[PDB]
Design a protein around this nucleic acid. Sequence first.
DNA 1: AGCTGACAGCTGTCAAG
DNA 2: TCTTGACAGCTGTCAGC
Lengths: 59, 64
Amino acid sequence: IFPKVATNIMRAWLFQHLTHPYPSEEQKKQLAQDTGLTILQVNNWFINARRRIVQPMID
Amino acid sequence: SMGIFPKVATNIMRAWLFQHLTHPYPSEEQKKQLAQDTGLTILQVNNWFINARRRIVQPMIDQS
DNA sequence: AGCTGACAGCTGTCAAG
DNA sequence: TCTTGACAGCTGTCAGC
């Protein structure tokens, strides 16, 4: 349900936008389609990533 | 924005809320029952109770 | 002239791998 | 077996009555 291929595609986007890790709705659409994820999965992933990757990198 | 809030909905939701003040958290079965009775979506029902908890229930307790 | 429905993102949490 | 995708409910906030 969560393709293992999705993770590195999503991380690539995240680590390339660390200063503003909030994809636009169009960016979410692209990421969803490219990863094989749903919009909900993409949204939840970035919520989790921001508190588990992005914030800890600043702390 | 093509959504609607049916006229009958407000008082049906209020009736449920004020009859369950000690635990204003409908079960999933109660939620779909309310959706049927009001003509609201499950999402609308969920959002309604989130708003009512902080705008009705909590303020009543603050004065309590 | 707010109320209030609505929604993007956050919090707290947990099953399952 | 500790990590992480997932989700019920919460926070912050806006826009049209």
